[PDB]
Amino acid sequence: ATKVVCVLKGDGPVQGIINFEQKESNGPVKVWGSIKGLTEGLHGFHVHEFGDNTAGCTSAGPHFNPLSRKHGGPKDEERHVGDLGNVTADKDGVADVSIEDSVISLSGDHCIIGRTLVVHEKADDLGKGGNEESTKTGNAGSRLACGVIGIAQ
Amino acid sequence: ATKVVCVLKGDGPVQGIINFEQKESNGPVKVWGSIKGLTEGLHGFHVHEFGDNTAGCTSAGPHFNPLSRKHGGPKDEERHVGDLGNVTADKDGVADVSIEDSVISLSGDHCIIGRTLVVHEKADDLGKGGNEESTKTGNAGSRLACGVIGIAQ
Ligand SMILES: *[Se]c1ccc(F)cc1C(=O)Nc1cccc(C(=O)N2CCOCC2)c1
Ligand SMILES: *[Se]c1ccc(F)cc1C(=O)Nc1cccc(C(=O)N2CCOCC2)c1
Ligand SMILES: [Zn+2]
Ligand SMILES: [Zn+2]
């Protein structure tokens, strides 16, 4: 019923297309698409608070956290709304994304429209890194590509 | 106050940064910023219906028209919500944008967050061009640069 999309771009070779669909406002969001140009392995994947790309992906600010929680993985109670975990890039640098998430939404206070989706340099440790930064960012390092989440047809 | 931003990008480079601010939901939106890389003269300036830039600016669809009206200028009662008229580039190719608009909003069904802002090749005739396309697009021609409209700090 509601369809949203994001095109991810940055300063390097990483580009992606992510689709979000939500049949009902009380239902999960399906997240699907592809990110290419990645190094093989896990890459942190988050909704960040601002749909602001003024100075590139850094302008998007911290993880989208309207409920003032610590950083976690998508299957944790203790997570930011924006905590979508990791995508996995294959040996050819392609991450085929396929996520169902119950915490993000396309309406209400958990709505991600007009926020920024970011794919990161390093794996997200999902809050299990053993340092203070693990509880804030998951130690996922720099921002390879991002885009503002917009309303689709 | 609500603050919103859009980064415009296209070939040339045609590039710009547009800020939006609304002090209250029943009040006007202030629009300001800069676009460079334009030909001297008028350029159509519109909010388009989809925040979909997956295939560049074409995926944005037609002008944002939630109230099912004909195309007009920003001062007209008969306009699309997304009809912000023209911006003006000087001989250096720079348009200084400064608009106040009472029809767009940063909340409710006139909200522009998650839609696309587009700067066009040609002047918008504000619905007065006396052909069929005038009361649909204003005859503003191709899409030089666009971006998805996002939430700012
Ligand atoms: Se979605 C979305 C994206 C961007 C943004 F700035 C706002 C929104 C909302 O729709 N925000 C929002 C939060 C909480 C509740 C609503 C909502 O739909 N209503 C207000 C409460 O009464 C029902 C309608 C919207
Ligand atoms: Se803005 C925006 C953009 C995109 C989208 F899908 C929804 C919205 C909304 O904010 N929608 C909305 C619907 C109903 C009511 C409101 C509203 O007036 N308020 C809720 C959010 O905070 C202000 C009050 C917004
Ligand atoms: Zn987080
Ligand atoms: Zn129009």
Residue numbers in the entry:
A (entry chain BBB), B (entry chain AAA): 1 to 153
From the reporting publication:
The copper- and zinc-containing superoxide dismutase 1 (SOD1) possesses four cysteine residues. The active and stable SOD1 is a homodimer stabilised by an intramolecular disulphide bond between cys57 and cys146 and metal sites bridged by histidine residues that are loaded with Cu and Zn. SOD1 possesses two additional free cysteine residues cys6 and cys111, is mostly distributed in cytoplasm and is responsible for converting toxic reactive superoxide into oxygen and hydrogen peroxide preventing oxidative stress within the cells. Extensive efforts have established that it is not the functional loss of SOD's enzymatic activity that is responsible for the ALS causing properties, but destabilisation of dimer caused by mutations or loss of metals in the metal site that leads to aggregation properties which are the disease causing agents.
In North America, half of sod1-related fALS cases arise from mutation of Ala4 to Val, with one of the most severe forms of fALS with the shortest survival time. One of the binding sites within SOD1 structure focused as a drug target is cys111, which is a solvent-exposed residue at the dimer interface that is vulnerable to oxidative modification giving rise to aggregation. Here, we have developed next generation ebselen derivatives based on the compounds previously published with improved SOD1 dimer stabilising effect and drug-like properties. In this work, we established a group of organo-selenium compounds using benzoisoselenazolone warhead of ebselen with potent SOD1 mutant stabilisation effect. A new higher diffracting form of small molecule-bound A4V SOD1 crystals has been established allowing us to visualise ligand pose of the compounds targeting cys111 in the pathogenic target enabling lead optimisation through structure-based approaches. We elucidated binding modes of compounds at the dimer interface of SOD1 mutant by high resolution crystal structures which are beneficial for describing structure-activity relationship.
